[PDB]
Design a protein around this ligand. Structure first.
Ligand SMILES: CCCCCCCCCCCCCCCCCC(=O)OC[C@H](COP(=O)([O-])OC[C@H](O)COP(=O)([O-])OC[C@H](COC(=O)CCCCCCCCCCCCCCCCC)OC(=O)CCCCCCCCCCCCCCCCC)OC(=O)CCCCCCCCCCCCCCCCC
Ligand SMILES: CCCCCCCCCCCCCCCCCC(=O)OC[C@H](COP(=O)([O-])OCC[N+](C)(C)C)OC(=O)CCCCCCCCCCCCCCCCC
Ligand SMILES: CCCCCCCCCCCCCCCCCC(=O)OC[C@H](COP(=O)([O-])OCC[N+](C)(C)C)OC(=O)CCCCCCCCCCCCCCCCC
Ligand SMILES: CCCCCCCCCCCCCCCCCC(=O)OC[C@H](COP(=O)(O)OCCN)OC(=O)CCCCCCCCCCCCCCCCC
Ligand SMILES: CCCCCCCCCCCCCCCCCC(=O)OC[C@H](COP(=O)(O)OCCN)OC(=O)CCCCCCCCCCCCCCCCC
Ligand SMILES: CCCCCCCCCCCCCCCCCC(=O)OC[C@H](COP(=O)(O)OCCN)OC(=O)CCCCCCCCCCCCCCCCC
Ligand SMILES: CCCCCCCCCCCCCCCCCC(=O)OC[C@H](COP(=O)(O)OCCN)OC(=O)CCCCCCCCCCCCCCCCC
Ligand SMILES: CCCCCCCCCCCCCCCCCC(=O)OC[C@H](COP(=O)(O)OCCN)OC(=O)CCCCCCCCCCCCCCCCC
Lengths: 459, 177, 606, 155, 37, 128
């Protein structure tokens, strides 16, 4: 994995030694070169994971998250270069440094062979995210949002530290490859109950779990566009990655510990989606949609059937692409009206037709239109949870109604109807913005041709 | 109720609006033109019966029970004109009513496609921006203290002035673009 | 094998070619609608060859040409099923769509998004032929959601109009409520039969098929606009007239009926599903034909007409006669598409007038439209040996002569009378009588697009029931022995409908005014179902979406219990610790109390 | 925008109520806040819960699709009372009478389908008769077993 | 009683400017000026 | 005589059938004139900015900003935990969680009891 970590670190001299007008073009070019290089991780086998060293390996779960992560950096650089154009050159280089450093932490978070190194990188991802939100966020509430984002994650994860060090003392190792073969069944006790909670609640917060999700409609909304892209597209999916790693060590206790949390998700996706029907802030509507979509990933990991893991990792990759594009579309209208009120700018298909078509495609992938990998993940999770209990389809199916309802209302409020009269600074769509939308949507639609690469280690 | 100039509906205006709505809902009930013609003259006779009532209390009472009469006897799906609010073609072409300022954001390769149109548009924008300060100082010298009482706007007073707040009435899009 | 499968796939690839043309364009077109119309005419000509060589031998096959994805035992492939249903439905859909697009080359001619319109309409056709030629549930679900999304994009065509966007989101709402049951059926077949392919579903032949058939009936209720999930189809007339003619009369709305026809080996062994389909389709064909008796908007009348015919299709599925139902689909496409085309020709000639109380005198004024509208209404009501006679009459001859829910039979016959009543309502208010439209007569229909497009479906509505019903092979045994009152039932009830509604029509010429009774207000306000359930069920959702979910839980209580209580606790303990007066006496007195508690109270010196 | 033009706490003195009504651009005798039970409304006005469909459509509105003006105090549920959502407009038949008619019609239809299912119609014939022991091999019977002899006779 | 004389004068002046605008929406015989194909 | 119109929550009373529409008293005249005055002032203040050629941007509506601030930010500072909010938060918050918990727990206890006893038909079930 050292053929990826070293170019990501060489992106630091590539942004701090660049000419003052070349610091976006060079970082975009070489980050796209790293993203083209990321395809070598697709050397996956049906039996063995691509095991590099004592420190790094990459199975078919971590590989699509890595390719999405290394792809997301050029898209964040294209997204965040317009509103940081009047910024000081040193703070501009510091912003690019925080994005590069966050990618650097993420690519060795997903390839951590050992779990306490996973913890160190997993909590290392807080600090560039916290600095990006609380420094380049636009409104007043970025400080409070950074506080909530920091202290939900740390309060969930400092018991995870004690739990992982307890596994290191008990089993002898926190290598995942060793613990595939030295896993002991976890019996029923209160000690093993709080063992389970300490191993799970950090990732429950990072997914987020319903009831614990209060950081997210502040952290995703008060962030800048690159912060919202990396928080929605990757940093939620650390929780699903970590749960899929750590429920190896939590059997058969998960079979009766998952019962409340599944309820919290199966009801939570009914609530948060319903919250999306009454959100006046468009960016908050996309945030609660992200909560509603990650509730299915929580359910699928907690029922721990193969169809559920295949659908959950397909839903993670698909929601990363779709939610990143929806935040970028909301930014494309925020850079024209300078407000996030959804009812303010209306009728935008009369003025911006191709950008309305990008809104249309992002809304159709949001509502899981087949054969998108959104629908492949959604459908496979629904199959596995019908196998879990035959009544859950009601909570699934009603969700698939409400998920349609706000996905098109967002399309009807913003793009359709009569245009707002007094708003006259609606510029034509830049080539940069349509490039951003196309680089989100075209990989998402190409993955419908060959979806087996985003279906996880048990395809 | 809700009018831009008047703060209310007078009794005479309420009687006229009830008369128009009664004839329209009756015509919805009375599809054919001769049958509607007969019953519309009968309804005109009913309106011309109590025409000369001088007691405003008694007249308001008669208007109120006539509204009760109408609400009991209205068509459930009345006739609506196509471009009328509730019709089948109402606000249909609002997706083609592009505002004028979008023409300011064209590329020069498509502005040069219409040279006379934009060369004629520049003097519209010129006339607008040199009429603007005169009509603003017209509005702030004629409006009473405490704000304008009604939503009515004054006309132009001089020979050379344009009427105040005129641009989004003159340069509104056509109803069939 | 080499001719059949090749021209089968050539039809679909040919239909996808103008999508590549409109996506790979630079220029202004040399009549791209003519290009799409020529493409669909060529697709009809191409698809007739596999249909004729199916009529010869009964030659069926499956083209599982592209392996897509293997989920451990579920090998999803790009698999096209060429059986009786695809071989009969693809040429009918292509012929009707070719007529609708030559209609649209005249009707939508003033639209500056006409290439976008023909693009969307061809995308609808591609998704629908994906639906009907599908072999597994995933590909059928692709076509299912595709025709739903193109229904959204074509109801909300004039998107600045609020009512079009409202009706489009309404149609999506009811279709996704049906999709709940569709995905329920897919879930049941994967978990209990390890398949989405129809062949393994049919060969395993499950007995406990209550739940998946309930899911499929719910899917057909949502997609084919049965009762409970009906109002989106009359709402769907808010789009343009060729959208209502192609999608919402003949092609999209029969997809739930097509879904229950496709699973006929599972319905011919489940009597409970047959009774549920029978009662539901009889309820729909009663209620929608009753609502059509009093409507004044002509597209709403023809929309309740096609939903009543869908209810009759659900009835004849429910009496275990699926091939009569599919024959009635292929029959119904012709005259119902032509009724919408003639109504839209009236609408265009009268300057977007759709209310029938401003029509009339169009007998001699629009004579070809008059002729084709009369032929379409006679085919709808089952005039003998027009196309609607060759299925619908036989349906009644099977609905009477079978072990049947008798209330469903009586409501089916009352629906059959109501078809005659609203058909002569259309002919009486649109064609007969005197003018009621305004005084600037611009009545004109002399475009060869309009004339030829109604002409081909007119020849279809004359001869297509005869041609198809003689060319198809027998799949059941037709019940042909029955008494004279039971053979003449449909024709007698239809003639009674015509006579009674002529009496009702001639009562309107009198100079007598009656108050509207509760039956007229019930049938005129759509059984009160779009009035209550579109005001109450959104209300009960959206307050629950804000007063309970948004504000109360995730802005107050889940925000109260974890972060705010802990934050106030830490603030309060911080203000109690650091509230020291700086006095040295008090600190050393606390040290003495510390040493006394450490010795006497905790025994730290032991 | 500034602080004293943003919503604040619930008004309890009449001068704070007058300042609230001046803030929300409406008359003090027309200004009615939500009742202080602690639901987070604050000083926000309780507008009388009318849909935007009920507004006068012929008026020259500032926002014609919303039927709403500039500076006009929006309803708390303005996202809910748009013309794409919940309509409170008056109906020619009473609401309770509509519910009576709809529930009575649906219940009568369900009861009569149950009556028709309990007493079904049929034809005055026997059962359909099939050869080869009621088609034993065709229905999927195994040939190593042997069914009971189903024999039909002439009549 | 119809319009006031102020309202009549305003509608006449707005009518004149509106008809000037709508007449100036017409095309020249040289427009559209197309590129050399 | 005629059946009187019954207004509902979702079917309001018409303006024509309303008695308080017909108030010819002078205090209602002053109320209607004062509302016309406020609406005329806001209309003038809007369309002075709206017709300005120098303006190229968003005419900011403090009513809309005020509404979006009231829907989100002012909810918790004007929350008081009392009997009504506690009962509605415990009835609507942990109520359905308990409900769906007992439903899914009872269903899975029933299904596991049928499977481990050899009752549930799990014949072709090999995808899970
Ligand atoms: C590996 C090689 C692969 C080669 C083949 C590639 C296959 C397709 C890949 C994805 C294509 C997306 C690009 C087009 C859409 C986005 C841009 C756009 O809108 O442009 C408009 C523009 C034309 O319109 P315009 O008038 O100029 O402007 C638009 C107007 O303003 C007004 O706009 P509008 O709204 O009127 O028009 C938009 C319209 C709006 O229409 C819709 O939104 C309706 C679509 C949904 C319903 C119908 C489809 C339902 C599903 C059925 C189809 C799938 C299954 C079929 C298979 C058989 C059955 C199983 O959409 C279309 O016309 C698109 C038609 C195709 C739709 C495909 C499905 C997308 C729906 C959302 C996701 C669904 C699930 C995933 C499906 C993935 C399929 C691969 O198109 C272009 O300029 C095209 C430029 C070139 C595009 C290249 C795309 C591939 C790039 C990949 C590069 C690397 C690989 C190399 C291959 C390169 C191939 C050339
Ligand atoms: C984001 C906010 C929510 C975060 C939730 C985090 C998880 C919730 C539960 C955490 C419990 C504490 C960590 C447990 C680690 C268990 C490791 C282990 O070996 O356990 C077995 C051990 C058992 O000891 P042992 O393993 O040495 O015993 C040998 C084995 N037997 C039992 C056979 C003899 O458990 C313990 O010793 C104690 C476990 C419970 C600890 C209770 C104290 C903490 C209370 C909860 C704090 C929760 C977070 C607080 C902050 C909230 C926000 C401000
Ligand atoms: C205008 C240009 C047209 C093409 C010009 C170039 C070709 C010219 C004509 C000569 C033919 C060329 C040789 C033949 C083609 C190659 C043959 C071959 O073996 O191809 C390899 C394979 C054949 O399948 P396969 O089984 O060998 O490989 C599948 C791969 N595995 C086994 C790993 C899963 O692929 C193709 O043929 C690809 C094209 C397929 C065509 C249909 C694509 C539909 C896309 C839908 C996406 C979403 C579907 C979701 C739902 C699916 C159903 C559930
Ligand atoms: C608010 C934000 C959103 C919500 C986020 C998540 C919050 C909740 C997280 C914890 C939920 C509870 C833990 C999961 C319960 C799973 C099953 C279980 O343990 O049930 C409780 C227990 C049942 O009894 P039993 O299982 O017999 O216990 C002996 C175990 N050998 O019951 C009992 O024994 C009785 C109760 C004893 C006290 C339990 C307290 C410790 C556990 C919670 C911490
Ligand atoms: C089809 C068979 C038609 C012939 C058999 C039925 C004849 C019949 O009952 O006709 C009654 C009636 C015509 O008579 P009536 O309308 O009362 O007279 C008005 C003055 N011409 O009404 C009609 O004939 C009109 C109804 C004909 C229905 C044809 C389609 C079914
Ligand atoms: C799920 C987990 C729930 C708990 C997460 C942690 C607490 C919530 C998040 C951090 C606090 C958020 C916040 O808004 O705090 C602000 C509040 C007052 O701070 P103030 O000075 O007013 O703000 C700056 C000037 N406006 O600050 C305070 O009142 C003090 C906050 C202290 C937070 C320390 C958290 C320690 C957790 C373990 C305690 C043992
Ligand atoms: C085989 C068995 C068959 C059984 C059939 C019966 C079962 C289903 C029972 C009925 C459920 C659906 C009907 C109720 C909801 C209908 C909502 C709807 O369509 O609202 C339309 C409304 C605008 O309509 P309208 O006013 O007519 O438009 C013209 C404009 N003047 O638009 C709006 O007001 C916009 C609203 C947007 C938000 C929608 C909120 C409501 C969502 C409801 C979801 C219900 C899911 C139920 C799932 C059950 C699964 C078991
Ligand atoms: C219970 C109850 O009514 O508590 C009232 C109490 C405040 O009492 P008060 O009404 O002010 O006198 O209120 C309180 O003491 C505060 C709340 C009491 C406990 C409520 C626990 C559940 C809250 C909802 C959780 C949602 C997740």
């Amino acid at each position: 994995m050292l053929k990826y970590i070293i170019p990501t670190m060489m992106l630091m001299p590539l942004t701090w030694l660049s000419k003052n007008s070349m610091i976006w073009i060079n970082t975009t070019l070489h980050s796209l070169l790293i993203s083209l290089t990321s395809l070598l991780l697709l050397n996956q086998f049906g039996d063995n994971s691509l095991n590099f060293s004592l420190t790094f390996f990459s199975d078919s779960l971590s590989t699509p998250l890595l390719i999405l992560t290394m792809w997301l950096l050029p898209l964040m650089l294209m997204a965040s270069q317009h509103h940081l154009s009047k910024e000081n050159l040193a703070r501009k280089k510091l912003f690019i440094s925080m994005l590069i450093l966050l990618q650097l932490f993420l690519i060795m978070t997903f390839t951590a062979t050992e779990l306490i190194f996973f913890y160190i990188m997993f909590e290392a991802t807080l600090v560039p995210t916290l600095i990006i939100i609380t420094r380049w966020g636009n409104q007043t509430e970025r400080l409070n949002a950074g506080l909530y984002f920091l202290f939900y994650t740390l309060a969930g994860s400092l018991p995870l530290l004690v739990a992982l060090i307890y596994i290191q003392n008990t089993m002898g190792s926190l290598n995942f490859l060793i613990l595939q073969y030295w896993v002991q069944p976890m019996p029923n006790s209160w000690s093993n109950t709080f063992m389970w909670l300490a191993c799970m609640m950090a990732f429950m917060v990072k997914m987020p779990l319903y009831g614990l999700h209060l950081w997210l409609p502040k952290a995703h909304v008060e962030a800048p566009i690159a912060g919202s892209m990396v928080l929605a597209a990757i940093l939620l999916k650390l929780g699903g990655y970590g749960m899929m790693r750590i429920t190896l060590l939590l059997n058969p206790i998960t079979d009766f510990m998952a019962y409340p949390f599944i309820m919290l998700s199966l009801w939570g996706m009914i609530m948060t989606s319903s919250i999306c029907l009454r959100q006046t802030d468009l960016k908050s509507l996309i945030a609660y949609s992200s909560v509603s979509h990650m509730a299915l990933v929580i359910v699928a990991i907690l029922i721990q059937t193969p169809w559920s893991y295949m659908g959950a990792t397909a839903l993670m990759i698909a929601h990363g692409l779709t939610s990143s594009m929806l935040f970028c579309l909301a930014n494309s209208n925020y850079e024209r009206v300078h407000s996030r009120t959804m009812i303010l700018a209306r009728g935008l298909q009369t003025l911006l037709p191709l950008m309305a078509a990008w809104w249309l495609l992002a809304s159709l992938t949001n509502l899981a239109l087949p054969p998108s990998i959104n629908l492949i993940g959604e459908l496979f999770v629904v199959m596995s949870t019908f196998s879990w209990s035959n009544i859950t389809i009601i909570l699934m199916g009603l969700n698939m109604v409400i998920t349609a309802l706000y996905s098109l209302y967002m399309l009807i409020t913003t793009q359709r109807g009569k245009h707002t009269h007094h708003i006259n600074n609606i510029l034509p769509s830049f080539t940069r913005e349509n490039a951003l939308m196309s680089l989100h949507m075209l990989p998402l639609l190409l993955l419908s041709l060959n979806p087996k690469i985003i279906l996880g280690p048990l395809y | 109720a809700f009018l831009p100039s008047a703060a209310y509906l007078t009794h005479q205006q309420k009687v006229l609006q009830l008369y128009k709505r009664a004839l329209r809902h009756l015509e919805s009930r009375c599809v054919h033109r001769d049958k509607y013609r007969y019953f519309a003259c009968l309804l005109r006779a009913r309106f011309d019966e109590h025409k000369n009532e001088k007691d405003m209390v008694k007249a308001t009472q008669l208007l109120r029970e006539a509204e009760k009469e109408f609400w009991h006897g209205q068509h459930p799906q009345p006739y609506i004109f196509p471009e009328s609010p509730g019709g089948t073609s109402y606000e249909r072409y609002e997706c083609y009513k592009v505002p004028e300022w979008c023409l300011d954001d064209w590329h020069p390769s498509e502005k040069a496609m219409y040279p006379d149109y934009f060369a004629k548009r520049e003097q519209w924008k010129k006339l607008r921006r040199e009429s603007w300060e005169r009509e603003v100082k017209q509005l702030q010298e004629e409006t009473p203290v405490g704000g304008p009482r009604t939503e009515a706007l004054p006309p132009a007073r001089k020979q050379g002035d344009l009427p105040p707040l005129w641009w989004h009435i003159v340069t509104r899009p056509r109803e069939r673009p | 094998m080499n001719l059949f499968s090749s021209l089968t796939l050539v039809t679909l690839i040919l239909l996808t070619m103008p999508i590549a043309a409109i996506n790979f364009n630079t220029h202004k077109f040399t009549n791209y609608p003519l290009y799409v119309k020529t493409t669909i005419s060529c697709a009809f000509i191409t698809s007739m060859i596999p249909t004729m060589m199916f009529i010869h031998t009964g030659q069926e096959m499956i083209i599982s040409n592209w392996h897509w994805l293997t989920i451990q035992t579920l090998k999803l492939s790009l698999s096209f099923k060429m059986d009786f249903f695809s071989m009969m439905f693809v040429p009918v859909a292509l012929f009707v769509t070719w007529s609708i697009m030559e209609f649209s080359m005249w009707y939508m001619h003033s639209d500056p998004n006409i290439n976008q319109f023909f693009k969307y309409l061809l995308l609808f056709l591609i998704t629908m032929l994906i639906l009907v030629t599908a072999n597994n549930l995933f590909q059928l679900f692709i076509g299912w959601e595709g025709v739903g999304i193109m229904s959204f994009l074509l109801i909300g065509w004039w998107y600045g109009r609020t009512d079009a966007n409202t009706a489009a989101l309404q149609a999506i709402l009811y279709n996704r409520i049906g999709d709940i049951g569709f995905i329920l059926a897919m879930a049941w077949f994967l978990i209990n039969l390890n398949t989405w392919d129809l062949q393994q579903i049919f060969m395993l032949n499950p007995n406990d098929s209550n739940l998946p058939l309930m899911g499929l009936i719910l899917a057909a209720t949502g997609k084919s606009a049965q009762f409970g999930l009906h109002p989106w189809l009359p709402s769907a007339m808010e789009g343009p007239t060729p959208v209502s003619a192609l999608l919402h009369s003949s092609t999209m709305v029969v997809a739930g009926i097509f879904l229950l026809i496709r699973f006929y080996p599972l319905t011919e062994n489940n009597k409970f599903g047959q009774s549920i389909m029978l009662c539901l389709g009889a309820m729909t064909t009663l209620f929608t034909a009753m609502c059509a008796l009093t409507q004044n908007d002509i597209k709403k009348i023809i929309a309740f007409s096609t939903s009543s015919q869908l209810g009759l299709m659900m009835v004849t599925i429910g009496i275990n006669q699926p091939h009569l139902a599919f024959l009635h689909i292929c029959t119904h496409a012709f005259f119902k598409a032509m009724l919408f085309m003639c109504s839209g020709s009236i609408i265009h000639s009268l300057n977007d007038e759709q209310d029938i109380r401003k029509m009339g005198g169009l007998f001699k004024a629009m004579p070809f439209t008059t002729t084709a509208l009369i032929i379409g209404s006679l085919a709808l009501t089952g005039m003998p040996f027009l196309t609607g006679f060759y299925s619908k009459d036989l349906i009644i001859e099977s609905a009477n002569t079978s072990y049947t829910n008798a209330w469903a039979l009586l409501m089916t016959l009352v629906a059959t009378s109501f078809t005659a009543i609203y058909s002569t309502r259309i002919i009486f208010f649109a064609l007969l009588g005197q003018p009621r439209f305004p005084t600037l007569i611009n009545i004109n229909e002399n475009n060869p697009f309009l004339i030829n497009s109604i002409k081909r479906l007119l020849i279809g509505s004359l001869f297509a029931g005869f041609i198809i019903s003689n060319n198809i092979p027998p799949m059941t045994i037709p019940q042909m022995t029955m008494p004279h009152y039971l053979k003449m039932t449909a024709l007698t009830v239809t003639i009674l409908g015509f006579i009674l509604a002529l009496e009702i029509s001639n009562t309107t010429h009198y100079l007598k005014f009656n108050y509207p009774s509760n039956t007229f207000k019930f049938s005129n306000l759509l059984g009160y179902y779009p009035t209550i359930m579109h005001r109450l069920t959104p209300y009960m959702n959206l307050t629950m979406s804000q007063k309970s979910a948004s504000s109360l839980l995730d802005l107050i209580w889940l925000e109260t219990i974890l972060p705010k209580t802990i934050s106030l606790a830490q603030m309060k303990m911080s203000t109690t610790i650091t509230s020291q007066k700086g006095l040295i006496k008090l600190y050393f007195l606390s040290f003495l109390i510390t040493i006394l508690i450490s010795t006497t109270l905790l025994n730290f010196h032991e | 925008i500034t602080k004293d033009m943003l919503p604040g706490p619930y008004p309890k003195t009449p001068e704070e109520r007058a300042a609230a009504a001046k803030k929300y651009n409406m008359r003090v005798e027309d200004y009615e806040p939500y009742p202080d039970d602690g639901m987070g409304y604050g000083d926000y006005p309780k507008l009388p819960d009318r849909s935007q469909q009920e507004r006068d459509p012929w008026y020259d509105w500032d926002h014609p699709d919303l039927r709403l003006n500039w500076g006009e105090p929006m309803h708390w549920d303005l996202d809910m009372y748009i013309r794409n959502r919940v309509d409170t407009s008056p109906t020619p038949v009473n609401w309770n009478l509509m519910c009576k008619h709809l529930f009575g019609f649906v219940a009568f239809m369900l009861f009569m389908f149950w009556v028709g299912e309990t007493y079904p119609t049929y034809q005055p014939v026997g059962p359909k008769q099939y050869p080869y022991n009621n088609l034993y091999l065709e229905r999927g019977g195994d040939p190593n077993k042997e069914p009971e002899p189903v024999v039909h006779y002439e009549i | 009683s119809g319009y006031t004389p102020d309202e009549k004068l305003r509608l006449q002046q707005l009518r004149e400017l509106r008809r000037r605008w709508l007449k100036d929406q017409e095309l020249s015989p040289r427009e559209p000026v197309l590129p050399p194909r | 005589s005629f059946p009187k119109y019954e207004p509902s929550r979702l079917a309001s009373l018409p303006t024509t059938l309303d008695p308080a529409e017909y108030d010819i008293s002078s205090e209602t005249r002053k109320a209607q004139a004062e509302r016309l005055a406020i609406r005329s002032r806001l209309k003038r203040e809007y369309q002075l900015q709206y017709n300005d050629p120098s303006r190229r941007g968003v005419v900011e509506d403090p009513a809309l900003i005020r509404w979006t601030c009231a829907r989100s930010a002012n909810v918790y500072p004007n929350f008081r935990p009392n009997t009504k909010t506690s009962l509605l938060g415990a009835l609507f918050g942990i109520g359905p969680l308990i409900f769906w918990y007992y439903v899914f727990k009872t269903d899975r206890d029933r299904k596991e009891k049928l499977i481990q006893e050899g009752k549930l038909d799990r014949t072709f079930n090999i995808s899970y």
